[PDB]
Design a protein around this ligand. Structure first.
Ligand SMILES: *[C@@H]1O[C@H](CO)[C@@H](O)[C@H](O)[C@H]1NC(C)=O
Ligand SMILES: *[C@@H]1O[C@H](CO)[C@@H](O)[C@H](O)[C@H]1NC(C)=O
Ligand SMILES: *[C@@H]1O[C@H](CO)[C@@H](O)[C@H](O)[C@H]1NC(C)=O
Lengths: 141, 306, 141, 306, 141, 306
């Protein structure tokens, strides 16, 4: 398995997910830095430096997007499944392993669906742009 | 911390052009903040201008929207999310503002036999809003239409059929020619109901007559005239006006029109420039008082030459 | 409410009903003067002079036509409902009120449907032409 | 008063061309009037001529209709109302006279493979009469058709399918080639039943063969002849006659025909005027004995020039 | 009833059945003389000379073809019904009557359908060509 | 007599190109004959060449078929009947040999939005074989395709829809862009099952992009150049190559093509011979690495002249 191709395909997939989020109209108008209270369980302020931090971050977004009822989020959730596997394949190359969070998400989906979806996709885009920008620099396990 | 917001009211259902106000309480960690600290936001995208804010009290802030435009849907979201925020920091809870363009026009047409009335309307402004029902409602007054139609509390639903052009067609059969039919579109939403502006139609006044029949066109060479004659349709019984279109028969007819306002006229004599040409003639009719539609043009009538 | 328009619309509606009856082929060939026995409960020999006589006459034809199973008679029955209301509106103008007949009709419909329909429409046409001709002369209540 | 009429019979169901008679008793207020006072009427529209009346007895009058024409329906009424009248005064009770054109023609055609027979018939004379059923009935004789077909008491119903052209198509499959199929249309009315004139068809005699195959057309310049050749269709096994149509290939072909009565002929030689022109040729076939249809024209065959 | 027409129609019908069997592809490649064991209950070796022998032969083929599940055999079975009736009509002309076989056929259809159908149609064709060739010579009852 | 045959095996289900062998015992009247007396036949039509026979033992004969061709069906019979015969005399019992062309090609295409993958396949070689089911099966590998695809024991059925062209279309939605989808057609016959050669597709590698958008064509008279410009489609994110076709606008365009291999190029300048003519231009794109399809040609762009 060519690692050079895996690193290039990981970057291409991240760009693909970012483009999908740009097409979801109600997310581009929202500032990913401007904070919303009650949705602190969604990765945002964290710098995300390590392979295990990247993996745990994407798993949280994966769990969040599964609950949302849109087909746009279902496709992004499938891309995140490929992205997590690519990160595990990159962790394998450099001989390191990665492991497998309150459930107040159920309440915020029931009361504030618009805020949950918009903030999740807006935070995901910011997280992916951070992962992409740090993939050029050799990441720690 | 224990931060929470309360909207008064939690949701608003209104129509285009209306005004709407939301009140809010921001309980920051078990204590209500001053209304001066509250700022408002629209879909977490843009701060609503402070000009629209109103300090109801030391703890209650208010936002007023004037002459509301129809809310543009963002995917599954048919409402606009209005936010009560504690300065730069907003909360996850929002107020749902639904503004629907309820200005639907209903046009009715009674057949040439005065047996039925078909009403047509477009749901172009309602198609986006699903999870709520849309139907034509009506009430019939024994005789005539009131000067200003009103949504009568007692009404009945009318079955409408979606057509291939995207419009709904509702057929009333049999009809009451001189009864006033007040109709409007009702949108039954989960939050309540909205009614479009009512219109009252007298079936007798929206008849599209059948075209004039037995249309003949002949050139009398003794006078050099083109004589056109016709028979008015069976209905309506009211006085009619006629319109005759005539031209030289060819690939693309260059039409000329003649108007007849004499209700008992069954013919017109036109002085033409060329006696040896074939002319094509069609006649159509409408109520002299203008209370109705123009009929379709009759089947073409032609003169001869040999 | 313009009474001049109500009087003109009443005459136009009567002409409309008469035209509908002319289109019903099997009624035009039948003489409305030539009597048929057993159908004496259908207005015919009466002169019909007053507003109340006109109203009671149309109500009888209304009750007769309701029982008949054709769609041509159903439309004429609706026109008669408008006509009775116009007569009440004309009676109101001139400050007068109008009120609200054997049931051997059920038997004649069962045994002789053709005679009931043909004679009812033929008698109705004659009655309407009498009402129309007497509307030019001021009618008594 | 107690006036009443009695018809003998109350209703008559018959077919075009037949004769029909009604008898009547007019009981005027508990006493039967003289037959001389009775006059007859048709649909309360016209008095039937006195010439058709017959004084059966001092109390019984009779009316006879000769060579009956199909009753024209007046809306819902499919029968003619015949009235027994006491001079100018008629009664509400009438006799129902139903005359139906039962002259329906059934045409059958067996396919080119001798696997099925399709029969076709038009219900143009029965479509108006509803409240009664209309079906094709048949009986099969082991071998051949009788000289004069008859409505056999034992018959079976055949399922027919209405086609877009308004005709019914009934398909028999598999078939018995040499069995006589006697068929007719039965109208089952509430008053009784009527049967159309029966026809007997031998499936072997109504075959429309497939067109001749392998049709070739060549110009032999050594003789100056147009040589046409073909292969007769697989079926039928009986002797066939052929028809060849030929002409100069162009926008609108001006056809010329040649007939071949030799059953074992597979070619024809035609002397043509122009040896350098392209000719188009088609061949069709039929049983030499004329017991069958002409096949469709074969696919066109063309000659060459260069 | 013209006997000349009946004799000509019998010959035409036999030719028709033979042509139908030629169109059934899997039968033409099989030699009707080359024997198959276990299917001796199908007429083949017999010369078929008399009207009663012809009738009993066609009745056996009729019973065999009824059990086979093809629509090609169903049409041939109908032609055989006409052929048997024509033979009875020809026996009537010449004042003679004709009458109305193990059931191991059920077993050979269950085990060997291809052999039953192919051999039955191949033997039938041979039998019909023998009947046709002997119809020119006056046949005995 | 008590004659019987036994085949080992009674029936064989195999695919084109394979080899197949049948063994047989001929019990003539309660005693097994010598294998030297046994001859083999195909559909009772032709003796199989003795070259294919093998004397397994004194009593067992064997027939070997090499590089089997798909069995041509003879009506209802989808198998070839193989016979064990005692010299000229064959028996009614046969062995059923079924050879099916299982070489079905499946082609997949991912949409321009990377939301679904549609796979297409023709059942032209399976349509004849009824009484057995035919379905597309698949297995998904988390990332990428293996070098040589294999029929994984664990697979799932995919619902395919027959199209008007006779091909089946199977749609995967949502998709996993970088997962290897191994798919094949499984024929579940009464005798067993056959699987077509598996193919592995990466949805990311079979994308047919949307055409380039905002295509403009302008003639700069200062340089005498035809300037073509475009915007690459939204997807894919990978480097693309472009192809421009251009010609003089007319009844039947005589095309000329220009290839662009610079992934970040949004324009091309072409030196044309006639500056006063209207040119028509279209642009299409494909992944520079060739892992995908060409997009459709963009909507035509035209230059002006006045
Ligand atoms: C809505 O607000 C505008 C602006 O203040 C005002 O003119 C209008 O009267 C208001 N509508 C109602 C129904 O009060
Ligand atoms: C019907 O009446 C005509 C005229 O009297 C007569 O010629 C004909 O024979 C009658 N039909 C029958 C069946 O008697
Ligand atoms: C099939 O037979 C041919 C010829 O003997 C041979 O070349 C080939 O290897 C055989 N196939 C297998 C799978 O053994």
């Amino acid at each position: 398995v060519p690692i050079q191709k895996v690193q290039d395909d990981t970057k291409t997939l991240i760009k693909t997910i970012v483009t999908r989020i740009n097409d979801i109209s109600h997310t581009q108008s929202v500032s990913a830095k401007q904070r919303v209270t009650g949705l602190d369980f969604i990765p945002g302020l964290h710098p995300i430096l390590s392979l295990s931090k990247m993996d745990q971050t994407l798993a949280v977004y994966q769990q969040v997007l599964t609950s949302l009822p849109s087909q746009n989020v279902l496709q992004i959730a499938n891309d995140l499944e490929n992205l997590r596997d690519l990160l595990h394949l990159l962790a394998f190359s450099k001989s390191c392993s990665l492991p497998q969070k309150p459930e107040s998400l159920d309440g915020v989906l029931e009361a504030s669906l618009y805020s949950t979806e918009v903030v999740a996709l807006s935070r995901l885009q910011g997280s992916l742009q951070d992962i992409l920008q740090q993939l050029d620099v050799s990441p720690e396990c | 911390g224990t931060q929470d917001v309360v909207y008064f009211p939690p949701k608003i259902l209104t129509s285009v052009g209306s005004n709407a106000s939301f009140h809010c309480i921001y309980k920051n960690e078990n204590q209500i903040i001053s209304s001066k600290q509250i700022v408002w936001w629209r879909n977490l995208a843009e701060k609503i201008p402070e000009i629209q804010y109103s300090i109801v009290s030391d703890r209650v802030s208010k936002v007023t929207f004037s002459n509301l435009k129809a809310t543009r849907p963002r995917g599954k979201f048919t409402y606009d999310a209005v936010y009560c925020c504690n300065e730069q920091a907003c909360h996850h809870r929002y107020a749902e503002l639904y503004v629907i363009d309820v200005n639907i026009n209903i046009s009715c047409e009674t057949d040439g036999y005065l047996t039925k009335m078909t009403c047509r309307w477009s749901p172009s402004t309602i198609q986006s809003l699903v999870g709520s029902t849309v139907q034509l409602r009506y009430h019939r007054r024994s005789l005539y239409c009131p000067d200003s139609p009103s949504i009568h509390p007692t009404s009945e639903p009318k079955n409408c059929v979606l057509q291939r052009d995207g419009f709904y067609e509702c057929v009333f059969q049999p009809i009451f020619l001189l009864s006033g039919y007040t109709m409007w579109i009702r949108i039954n939403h989960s939050l309540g109901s909205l009614d479009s502006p009512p219109t009252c139609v007298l079936p007798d006044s929206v008849v599209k007559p059948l075209p004039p029949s037995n249309v003949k066109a002949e050139i009398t060479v003794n006078t050099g005239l083109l004589k056109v004659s016709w028979e008015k349709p069976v209905f309506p019984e009211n006085n009619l006006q006629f319109q005759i279109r005539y031209g030289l028969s060819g690939k693309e007819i260059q039409w000329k029109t003649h108007e007849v306002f004499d209700a008992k006229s069954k013919s017109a004599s036109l002085l033409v420039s060329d006696l040896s040409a074939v002319y094509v003639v069609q006649v159509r009719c409408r109520r002299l008082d203008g209370l109705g539609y123009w009929s379709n043009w009759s089947s073409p009538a032609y003169t001869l030459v040999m």
